Design a protein around this nucleic acid. Structure first.
Ligand SMILES: Nc1ncnc2c1ncn2[C@H]1C[C@H](O)[C@@H](COP(=O)(O)NP(=O)(O)OP(=O)(O)O)O1
Ligand SMILES: [Mg+2]
Lengths: 51, 428
DNA sequence: CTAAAAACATTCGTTCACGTGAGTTCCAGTACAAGTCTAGTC
DNA sequence: GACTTGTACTGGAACTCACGTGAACGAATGTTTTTAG
């Protein structure tokens, strides 16, 4: 269990109540793939350069 | 090449293959000359996202493989190449593009005469004040700082020279800074001018009067030397003897008196037991010209004969009529007040005699020749680093219950893995 | 002049790359407490 | 006072989760233009 955000419901500029938002229904995805060097199966990184 | 006087070489390690290829292609398009492989023809080299120091490491590894006499290229950054490509011509090169003093005093020789007399005197005064206050640790640390300052090969003129010196914290650094910047230090004068310091120094010089007795007298209202003589009923033999011969014992001794006393003691020991050998230890063995007492060590090269030498020699000297004070009026130690007749009359000078067999002779000599601070530091180093216990009698190993006797003092230092120092270099 | 084929335009699901906010937990740094400072004789 | 050892605190970084932007790729479906007979 984890709160996506803790927000403030404002009935009026002077009246504020703290609330928390949760996702009781979330889509399921496969774990992200990770790139590996072919020759040694050592993890690699991707760097983006603009020039 | 449009510019025959320019030869640019890139670096693969950090830039990468693709970036190197693109930059080389762009430079070739712009008419520049780019060398595929490093060679002597290269005049400038460009790095990228590399620290300057690391770049130097690259240069040296390339210098060893080049013929001698070749002018080294000039280090440059990718910014230079980018600016040159953007402006269309090579831009001018600018700045952007382009074991020690061991803590222990036993490891550092300390000559008697140094170039930091004032600072050492101030630190000694502070240490004496701390000792009077009753804090032994403060005295020890101040003495260590003074000793460190004493061993400096060159005079100290700027605070930056105190960084690497051990046993130099906030207080000592501040004291030295005050001494250097303004000359006389405020704290030193404040402590010295204090009446308590002066009266404690006056009382301590009395033979048989320590710090505790001096403080007790100070808190009892006793402030002057004469006041002590007004109540000669709360003083032991030592205090009475010291107070009576105060002026005589206040004068530092000279070397001629040492020679006369040595001759007298040599005659006494020779007549008492034949073959006795006497060695002069203490400050006078370290090269000092002045002292407070004369210290001797008596031994017999043959093993097992100095069982009761000292009482016989002491009683013989007393019969001769020279001992004003004997510690005990079988012992192997005594301090006295000799009666030296001056050639012009006589003056009282203290003399200490200690006996030790030949087996324990080197240890006794080492323990009775070096300074107090040097002995403390050597014993601490032996106990902590090497785990052995060193005392005036011998060196002992808690693990193996066997003594480490030796036939010479050099072996004592050799066993501890320490460079030998002469007696003149053991001053604090 | 008409029909077939090629090219172009728009939409849709999926995967990948990065960036950014929020919540939870670990850890490396900093502060402070306490011990030590030499060894012996008398 | 200076150093060494041990304990406690704690603010930030790392990690995870979730969403949004931008791009490529296949894939489709439809629509428009060009060329052959
Ligand atoms: N507290 C101590 N701890 C260890 N060893 C010590 C010691 N005190 C002395 N020794 C050792 C080392 C000492 O060298 C020796 C006795 O020396 P002194 O006669 O007490 N003082 P000196 O004659 O050297 O100098 P000056 O003429 O200025 O008074 O015993
Ligand atoms: Mg002496």
């Amino acid at each position: 269990k984890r709160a996506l955000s803790r927000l403030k419901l404002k009935l009026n500029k002077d009246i504020v109540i703290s609330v928390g938002i949760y996702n009781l229904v979330q889509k399921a995805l496969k774990p992200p793939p990770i790139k590996l060097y072919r020759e040694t199966n050592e993890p690699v990184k991707t760097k983006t350069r603009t020039f | 090449t449009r510019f025959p006087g320019v030869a640019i070489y890139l670096v693969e390690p950090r830039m990468g293959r693709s970036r190197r290829a693109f930059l080389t292609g762009l430079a070739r398009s712009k008419g520049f000359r780019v060398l595929d492989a490093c060679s002597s023809e290269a005049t400038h080299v460009v790095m990228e996202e590399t620290s300057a120091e690391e770049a130097v490491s690259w240069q040296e590894r390339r210098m060893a493989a080049a013929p001698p006499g070749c002018t080294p290229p000039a280090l440059l950054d990718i910014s230079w190449l980018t600016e040159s490509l953007g402006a269309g011509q090579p831009v001018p090169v600018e700045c952007r593009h382009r074991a020690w003093m061991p803590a222990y005093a036993c490891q550092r020789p300390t000559p008697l005469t140094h170039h930091n007399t004032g600072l050492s005197e101030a630190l000694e005064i502070l240490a004496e004040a701390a000792g009077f206050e009753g804090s032994e640790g403060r005295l020890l640390t101040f003495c260590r700082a003074a000793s460190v300052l004493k061993a400096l090969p060159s005079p100290v003129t700027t605070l930056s020279q105190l960084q690497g010196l051990p046993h130099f914290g906030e207080h000592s650094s501040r004291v030295v800074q005050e001494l250097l910047e303004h000359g006389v230090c405020e704290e030193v004068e404040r402590v010295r001018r204090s009446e308590r310091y002066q009266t404690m120094k006056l009382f301590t010089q009395i033979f048989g009067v320590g710090v505790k007795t001096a403080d007790r007298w100070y808190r009892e209202g006793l402030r002057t030397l004469d006041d002590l003589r007004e109540q000669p009923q709360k003083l032991t033999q030592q205090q009475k003897a010291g107070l009576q011969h105060h002026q005589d014992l206040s004068t530092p001794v000279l070397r001629s008196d040492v020679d006369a006393l040595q001759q007298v003691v040599e005659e006494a020991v020779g007549q008492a037991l034949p073959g006795a050998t006497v060695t002069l230890t203490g400050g006078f063995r370290r090269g000092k010209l002045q002292g407070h007492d004369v210290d001797f060590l008596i031994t017999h090269p043959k093993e097992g004969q100095e069982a009761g030498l000292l009482p016989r020699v002491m009683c013989r000297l007393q019969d001769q009529g020279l001992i004003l004070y004997h510690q005990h009026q079988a012992f192997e130690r005594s301090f006295c007040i000799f009666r030296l007749p001056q050639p012009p009359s006589w003056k009282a000078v203290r003399v200490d005699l200690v006996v030790a067999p030949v087996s324990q002779f080197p240890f006794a000599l080492l323990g009775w020749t070096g300074s107090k601070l040097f002995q403390r530091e050597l014993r601490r180093f032996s106990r902590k680093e090497k785990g052995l216990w060193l005392n005036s009698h011998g060196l002992f190993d808690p693990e193996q219950k066997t003594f480490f006797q030796a036939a010479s003092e050099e072996d004592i230092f050799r066993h501890l893995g320490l460079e030998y120092l002469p007696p003149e270099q053991r001053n604090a």
